[PDB]
Design an enzyme around this catalytic site. Sequence first.
Site, mmCIF file in Angstrom:
data_model
loop_
_atom_site.group_PDB
_atom_site.id
_atom_site.type_symbol
_atom_site.label_atom_id
_atom_site.label_comp_id
_atom_site.label_asym_id
_atom_site.label_seq_id
_atom_site.Cartn_x
_atom_site.Cartn_y
_atom_site.Cartn_z
ATOM 1 N N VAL A 1 0.847 -1.178 0.000
ATOM 2 C CA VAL A 1 0.000 0.000 0.000
ATOM 3 C C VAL A 1 0.890 1.238 0.000
ATOM 4 O O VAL A 1 0.499 2.284 -0.527
ATOM 5 C CB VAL A 1 -0.951 0.013 1.234
ATOM 6 C CG1 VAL A 1 -1.678 1.349 1.364
ATOM 7 C CG2 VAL A 1 -1.967 -1.110 1.138
ATOM 8 N N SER B 1 5.446 2.632 0.730
ATOM 9 C CA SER B 1 6.834 2.481 1.183
ATOM 10 C C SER B 1 7.467 3.844 1.460
ATOM 11 C CB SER B 1 7.674 1.717 0.151
ATOM 12 O OG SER B 1 7.366 0.329 0.140
ATOM 13 N N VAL C 1 4.377 -0.587 3.967
ATOM 14 C CA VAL C 1 3.058 -0.941 4.489
ATOM 15 C C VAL C 1 2.350 -1.907 3.540
ATOM 16 O O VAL C 1 2.380 -1.725 2.321
ATOM 17 C CB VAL C 1 2.162 0.314 4.701
ATOM 18 C CG1 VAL C 1 0.793 -0.073 5.284
ATOM 19 C CG2 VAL C 1 2.851 1.332 5.595
ATOM 20 N N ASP D 1 0.458 9.624 11.998
ATOM 21 C CA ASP D 1 1.663 10.263 11.466
ATOM 22 C C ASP D 1 2.364 9.208 10.610
ATOM 23 O O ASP D 1 3.106 8.379 11.132
ATOM 24 C CB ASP D 1 2.567 10.719 12.613
ATOM 25 C CG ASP D 1 3.755 11.563 12.153
ATOM 26 O OD1 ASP D 1 4.127 11.500 10.957
ATOM 27 O OD2 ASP D 1 4.325 12.286 13.015
HETATM 28 C C1 LIG Z 1 4.730 8.993 15.296
HETATM 29 N N1 LIG Z 1 3.245 8.937 15.410
HETATM 30 N N2 LIG Z 1 2.637 9.995 16.096
HETATM 31 C C2 LIG Z 1 1.323 9.700 16.049
HETATM 32 C C3 LIG Z 1 0.305 10.638 16.674
HETATM 33 C C4 LIG Z 1 0.992 11.949 17.034
HETATM 34 C C5 LIG Z 1 -0.800 10.990 15.708
HETATM 35 C C6 LIG Z 1 -0.304 10.005 17.919
HETATM 36 C C7 LIG Z 1 1.036 8.520 15.377
HETATM 37 C C8 LIG Z 1 2.310 8.069 15.000
HETATM 38 N N3 LIG Z 1 2.805 6.995 14.315
HETATM 39 C C9 LIG Z 1 2.101 6.418 13.349
HETATM 40 O O1 LIG Z 1 1.030 6.888 13.008
HETATM 41 N N4 LIG Z 1 2.638 5.333 12.795
HETATM 42 C C10 LIG Z 1 2.056 4.525 11.876
HETATM 43 C C11 LIG Z 1 2.349 3.162 11.903
HETATM 44 C C12 LIG Z 1 1.785 2.300 10.968
HETATM 45 C C13 LIG Z 1 0.938 2.810 9.979
HETATM 46 CL CL1 LIG Z 1 0.193 1.735 8.742
HETATM 47 C C14 LIG Z 1 0.650 4.177 9.941
HETATM 48 C C15 LIG Z 1 1.217 5.035 10.880
#
Ligand SMILES: Cn1nc(C(C)(C)C)cc1NC(=O)Nc1ccc(Cl)cc1
Length: 332
Positions: free
Chosen positions: A26, A28, A31, A161
């Site tokens: 999905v 890179s 994911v 994020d």
């Molecule tokens: C670093 N980080 N910070 C947040 C917040 C601030 C929104 C809680 C969330 C995240 N990390 C992520 O959102 N990580 C993440 C892991 C896997 C997938 Cl498929 C998508 C995203």
Amino acid sequence: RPTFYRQELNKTIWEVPERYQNLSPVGSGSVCAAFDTKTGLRVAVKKLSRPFQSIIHAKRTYRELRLLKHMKHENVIGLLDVFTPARSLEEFNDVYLVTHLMGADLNNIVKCQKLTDDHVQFLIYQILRGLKYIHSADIIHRDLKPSNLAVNEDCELKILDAGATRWYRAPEIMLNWMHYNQTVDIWSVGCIMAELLTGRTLFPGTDHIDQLKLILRLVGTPGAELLKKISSESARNYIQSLTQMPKMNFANVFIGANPLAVDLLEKMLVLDSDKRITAAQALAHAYFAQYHDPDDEPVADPYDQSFESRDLLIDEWKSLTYDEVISFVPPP
Ligand SMILES: Cn1nc(C(C)(C)C)cc1NC(=O)Nc1ccc(Cl)cc1
Ligand SMILES: CCCCCCCCO[C@@H]1O[C@H](CO)[C@@H](O)[C@H](O)[C@H]1O
């Protein structure tokens, strides 16, 4: 340890529990979408890229696991699972994270569908609700933008994020103020909201300096009260020579829009970050009367981020990350 299986996807090796099937890339970290057999829902699986290559990378891996494990809110990404093929701390070199697959992000929704005022109240309401929770754990997003907002076919939203990039950034971050209160995320919300209302990017800067130029054309050059607070002699002089742009009347800028939406945008899009509305305050703003429930806007448990001050060896951060994988308790 459940049973694992190897597969190559886009020249990447993936070793996951047989729990997760039908893996297809999905994005890179890389994911994949997957089918969770134990629950029968679609999930996203992220394979962490070079997690323990440097001390800074090793600390980021740890930070990422620590964060996702803590986030337990409807409008914030949550961790369904974390696994490693590794049978031991010595074998430990890969980290995978599992979360809900949400089919689409907020750009996609905006760039082909025109949103009603009701769509805007609901989507912004959810961003603020999730932000109230994030902010209550003394966490700042710092990179809020439509691609970091996952949205389902009920326009229910979560903040994540995933890792153009700068159109939503607070002016203080792009002058590297390097202090930043949590209302930098509120700046980002004002930018997102304006774009949902108009269908157009509010500040589509071509580069760093164009970005700032466009921001000042709307909100004006800093007033006397703001200038008063700038301790840096050079920053003051940088600012004071630029042609003195007047603050625009937002009612004259966002023509077709709910007067309450305009009022809220004025309270979010303030140069002075001390004067910007907070997430909690914004939730009780009349724009959201139809959605606001003061008894259903939860705050986070205390989040220990003392690790942020710590300078440790790669193998220390690695061991600490390994402990977090082992202690993980999946949601209900
Ligand atoms: C670093 N980080 N910070 C947040 C917040 C601030 C929104 C809680 C969330 C995240 N990390 C992520 O959102 N990580 C993440 C892991 C896997 C997938 Cl498929 C998508 C995203
Ligand atoms: C070109 C001029 C842009 C100036 C906008 C920056 C003003 C942001 O606001 C400032 O943010 C700081 C937090 O980092 C606070 O310490 C200050 O008190 C606050 O006024």
